[model samples]
Target: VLKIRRPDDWHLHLRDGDMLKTVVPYTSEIYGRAIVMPNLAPPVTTVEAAVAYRQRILDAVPAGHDFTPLMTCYLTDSLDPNELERGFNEGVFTAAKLYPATSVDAIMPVLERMEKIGMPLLVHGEVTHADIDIFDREARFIESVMEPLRQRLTALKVVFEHITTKDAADYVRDGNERLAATITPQHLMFNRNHMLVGGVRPHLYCLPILKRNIHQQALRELVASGFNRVFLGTDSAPHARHRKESSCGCAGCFNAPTALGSYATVFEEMNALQHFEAFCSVNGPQFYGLPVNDTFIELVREEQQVAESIALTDDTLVPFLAGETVRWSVK
Candidate 1:
């Protein structure tokens, strides 16, 4: 058994209502805290919304699980700087997420405020231009968006969330202290072939969709090197099975239930179990300027089969690695 400090998910999506209730436990049972995404339908754009959403998440936690949901504000073109300031100052907002719906130029004032206050900007990191090749969006985004933004906002703390490409990894590595990145278990474990080579696996689809094996290798190597700025952020998004299997399925992978085990498999394969604890628990809190969890959890190197699917009230949701066997299990 390998014992490590409780980890935190710096990027996660626990959709609201029944979906929230169903998925919260999978994460809460393992993580000390999670930087909850603010991309709900209406989106959590204000302090009031974040507060209410946070309480709902807390209520959904299993009776004995110790979990805290760190809320964030969804950035929009007209987002109120004063409101973001208020939320951050009052501890209602842990960070703000940028979806790239609006150009960075349009939101300079708001980003400026965040920079001034040392609030981190969590970015999806993919360009959404219609003409850019789907697979090339992330690399293009780094050139056209991330680079310019960071150059202009020198002191801004930014978390390049769910990064997928070697270009992204290199950029973040070369970046200054204010820059860091989060790697999802899905991105680290699989590649584009796993999604397309086997007759199209929709459940493996997610934004910043899995890249080529070369990129995957870079990510694994970066973590294996014990890169201090890289940490876990299982962008474990859930959508009903119907939604994923449809003609134009939504983008996300529900991997919360199997995240830690999957991560353990990756580190073991890389011969880097020595750095697993820091990747899973310590690096994130250090970057976010929070204390590490005092508690600990252990994982055993035993094989376990993942459930094929999870049941929701109306429809089912398929998890990452569904029906596959993982070599590790939380104990």
Candidate 2:
């Protein structure tokens, strides 16, 4: 058996209502905390909204489970800087997330205030321009948006969330202490071919879409090197089975159920089990100025089959590694 500190998902999406209740336990059962994403249909932009949403999340946690949902503010052009400060000061908002939906320039004031208050900025680092190739959006984003933003706001703490490319890993590694990143389990285990070459696996579809195998290798190598700036963030986005198998599928992988085991598989394969604890549990809290989880969780080298689908009321939702076997199981 392998034992380590209980891990926290640095980034995750526990959608509200039924989906929220259905998915929360999958993560809460294993992780001590998770940085809940704020990109619901309306998005959580204010302190009141975050508080309400947080309550709903708390209500959903299964009895006897010790889990905290770290709320985040979704950046919008009309967002008030004072409100962000209030949320942070009151501890309602752990960090502010930037989606490509809003122009960074329009929200400069809010970002500046967050920097001044030492609040971190979580980003979906992909350029949504029509001309940019889908595979190159992340690399392009670094050159066009990320580099400029970091240079201008040097003191700001930024987490390049769910990074899928070598460019992202290298950029974060070469960056100053203020910069860090979160890598997802799917990105570490699969490449574009895993999504396309076989039969176009819709469940594997996610934003910052899986890159080529070369990029996958780079991410594996970075983590194997025991890089302190890199840590875990399973962007385990859940979409109903109908929505996923539809003519137009959404971008996310509901990997929460198998995330820990998958990460263990990767680390073991890379011959870096020694660094697993830091990647899964330590680095995130250190960067966010939070304390490490005092509790511990164990993983045993036993093969377990992942559920093919999870019931989401009327429809079922497919999880990452559906029908596949993971070599490790949380004990």
Candidate 3:
């Protein structure tokens, strides 16, 4: 295997303090950069918080490692356009993220401001209401909210972060350049059956929770289609071992360590090796209007078993593809 432009994780969540300290190295050592998620506790709403968080990430980067963490602001009800613009102008904020905040009336002004300035909106893209079935929430959200929002704000650039279903795939595929998505490694690797069959596998469970085998196949097909709009974004969210094993565990998979290897597996499965570099390295920065990296990363066709668990501060983290042999490994 020849070296390719090193991939940048377009969607990653490096949580604060100890968790950040533990997980940053996994990503930094592999990806040349990452679009850091902003959904931390108390969230990064202001420019100040975002700045401090970015600094914390840089501090956590392993010595002699090369990595860049592109920070995003968590949009709140009262998102200040000036603050958003300030961070963007200073180059500290690469994008803005939306979680459960769907009050269009509250943030329409900021949305317009972002669209005007060419900053993309990175949405968590799932409904949290109990009325919606867990499995169908993603599809329903697209029909109910995502489609409508896009239609209303025609000019707004958006990334449907961690997209899981065929609905998202078709929507982004049909939309213009302003629309794109970040596909997580877990969603492509397993279906709901893998998480539920035999027993509930909390480690495989993540937000935009896994769908049926049909959806998984559709995602694989979409990526195989070489859709440039759909690219690598691990959504490599890390939750502590105890937190994940609990009855009501948090919704995240710490897939940072095995992200590229996992994606290589998917590409190989679909016979889409031709487009792997574009999906992993080019699409993200191209959509963000940044230049591709000159540096290279090599992935050889070799089998390697993922470690069962990785140690963190006073805790351990379960990585994706644990115990399984992946066909690719970074050299």
Candidate 4:
């Protein structure tokens, strides 16, 4: 029963081609702008392709929806410094993403250059070492990878994307303005038990895979405490229904359709309604040094059941909180 500035998604994945058309509307309808991920099959590494992809996203936006897609470049050890500068200078690429498999130390020159230009680096935050337990990768990555890099390059702006652990939340909270994080609705609303201990729930599964209850509590508290460093990033990754509901399902949740409602439920439950807009709208733009949207949305006190699956041209996909009634909706 309140009106607030429209929120922006700090992190999101609008797959490609057909899936892009299918999922873009869910975000465009609700969010004013979103940082588009560059992890397509070819991975957007060039300034030219990044600009082209942004145009594609703009084209996919439905009429009557005012949406802007901020683009990113996927990083590799061999990523060129000149290309990064060209993209950022031309205003085509807003930031760059770091994958754990791509050694952090090896990319110091690239990150250092980004730091100088004030372009932020987004991180996946999980080390894929075989010895570490699946749930422990996030924690381990912080200790092994992130900490060392941060110490050496304090000026490098970093966003710990889709943070799923207390270790990560605490790290972002303690870091300087150059460091911030994006929290997913799924991480705030559910824990590992929601996916395990009953039967495996594939939709609840995602990278930086859901942690234990204690970690879940930390994430909820981080947002609830009105921490400015934490902001909304659905990480609303999508997969075809078959890919998601299979024996060995993919690591993503197509939560774009339900992200705001899920996030609203958590903020309401935590008695942190005052900070909702900051987490969803203000903090993200501030960290990125961009303008907040000049728009607003109304969230009505309503209960509506979400559709279980949305049909695409050739496949269907499930949504987060499917079949559940959410307490708020855009009016």
Candidate 5:
């Protein structure tokens, strides 16, 4: 068994109040800290909210625990450079999330404002419209969505979140070194077909909506390319079982428990074992200038298949790669 010390998640959604209180420990179990997302009900936009939320997270931490949650300013149409720089300087926030706003004003102006202040913008890259074809939506996103931001911020450290397409991989790989991305295990192995199989298998669903099989092939190829920018952020968004299994299932996958196992199996399957460290442990902290984990964990799955679910109190917390056997398991 091999143990590799790993740092915290640079991108995580620790929802507020009870949800944050409930799930922060699972993350604490495996990581030293996490870049806690600012997406909450009425997403965190103001410095006061960001500050208060950070305190709430600190308050939620059980005494004597070492976990830390890095606060982020959720970019909104109202974001101002002065407030962003104040948050940065006052130690209330570390960066900003630049995903497309679900409103009418389109926040490129806000992004430009943040860019002027030079805040690290973690971009959630995906072309999204109810009408756009899933395949072409991703292509369109690369062209129309992510492309413009680079032009606006010449030196911006944009971490393209959960990159799901060849266009994204190529853009990050061949484009500015200042640009980087976090890859999720689900995207590495499964494609749009995996979720849609057998009458819309809702549990396997997530955002940056899944791409075609060719894109999956391209992702594997990119992983094998040994790019330093390709690091891990499980994007391990968790939803209650009800939220996931209902008719209108929420768009997320809860896979933190088996996150590394999934990563190991995908890299092994792709025969890209040599690049594992860069993806799973290196680039995220390298880009963020955060510390690597002081301890290491181990996984061994020469030929074993774990039970697909674990008991989370009375409920069963299912992994995203349920029913599928992997070549490894993390301990």
Candidate 6:
């Protein structure tokens, strides 16, 4: 019953101010740190902004907690890599994020900056809206968006954040040492079918939509490969349940509360528990040039049900894994 200090969340998003106040502590309580995504309304584009947001995150942490929020840059077409290098040199930013900053008609300069700075680039794999069937979209992005980025950047450090397609997963799996990816529990489990409950399950929808069974199997195999390139990012974006369930539902699933549990279950079901530690804990830090955690947390065999809700305001905080039961409790 030795508790191992849990691993870091390689990719995570904490909205600014009120939203940050609401969801981050759940992750902080169990994991050592996380690579905070940079998708705020306008996005945290500047080092000053990232540092300020980092400070706000520090303030939000309840006293004496050892959790750290590793900051990242949201790569918009307008980003200045000199700014990125300055921030990274100053210890303000740990990585760079890739949105479909391609269509901006002003991206060549930004891409050059990324090359010069040599920061870890986390990518959102959805292409800038080509209207391909949602099911086939990520695959299209791998071909149309991600591959081109990789070929061009050759030396740029990159992570295909939340890999959802078989081709995409395989590409990253065999990609050069400079490339890697983060996996999310939801994508690893249920497919699009899970989102169809009672007409529509808003909380179930997320970007880089779930792939076919073949793709799922591909991920299982990739995880089992003991590849250090694959790690847990959770891509755990939280939008209010209202926004998720509407006619024009926004994309993202907030699974922070039970992400580790869900990931643990997936590994057990895949019969890869022996390799789970590397996937969930060891790999991300190794890929990012960070140190492994010294402490440990227990991942038990006993099960308990997760609560149906967490009240965050007038709005109830509905975790991504709400109403679920997991065997391994973080103790």
Whole-model Cα lDDT per candidate? 0.93, 0.94, 0.88, 0.90, 0.75, 0.80
- TM-score each candidate: 0.98, 0.99, 0.97, 0.98, 0.88, 0.94
Worst 10-residue lDDT window for candidate 5 reads 99-108
The candidate 2 region of ten consecutive residues with least summed lDDT is 312-321
The better candidate by lDDT, 2 or 6, is 2
lDDT for each residue of candidate 2 in 1-331, tens digit (9 for 90 to 100): 7899999999999999998999999999999999999999899999999999999999999998899999999999999999999999999999999999888899999999999999999999999989989999999989999999998999999999989898998998899999999999999999999999959888999998999999999999999999998999999999998988899999899999998988998999999999999999999999999999999999999989999888977989888888888888888
The residue pairs that clash in candidate 2, if any, are none
Question: What TM-score should be assigned to candidate 5?
Answer: 0.88
lDDT of 6 at 24: 78
Runs off by more than 4 Å, candidate 4: none
Question: How close is each model in CA RMSD to the real structure?
Answer: 0.9, 0.7, 1.2, 1.0, 2.8, 1.9
Query: Model 4 reaches what TM-score against the true structure?
Result: 0.98
Evaluated against the true structure, the overall lDDT of model 3 is: 0.88
Task: Write the number of the candidate with greater lDDT, choosing between 4 and 6.
Answer: 4
Q: Candidate 6 lDDT, tens digit per residue, 1-331?
A: 3244477899888887687898878788878889999889878999999999999998898776789999988777667768888888898899877777545235657666666777777777776565678787777778787777777777888888888878877898778888898888888887766777456777877887766778888887788677779998888788766676677877888888888878888887887777788777788888888888987788777787887777665666667767877777777
Error of 6 at 172 (Å): 1.2
Q: Using lDDT as the measure, what is the rank order of every candidate, best first?
A: 2, 1, 4, 3, 6, 5
For model 1, how does the per-residue alpha-carbon lDDT over 1-331 read when each residue is reduced to its tens digit? 9999998888999999999999999999999999999999999998999999999999999999999999999999878999999999999999999997867888999999999999999998888889989999999989899999998999999999999999999998888888999998888899999999959989889988889999999999989999899999999999998999999998999999998988988999999999999999999999999999999999998899999998999889898888999888888
Ranking by TM-score: 2, 1, 4, 3, 6, 5
- Candidate 5 lDDT, tens digit per residue, 148-180? 657766777788888888888888889877788
Report the error of model 2 at residue 161, Å: 0.7
Query: In candidate 1, how many Å is residue 15 off?
Result: 0.4
**Residue 329 displacement (Å), model 4:** 1.1
The reply for model 3, stretches above 4 Å from the true place, is none
The alpha-carbon lDDT assigned to residue 238 of candidate 6 equals: 80
User: What local lDDT does model 3 show for residue 288?
Assistant: 93
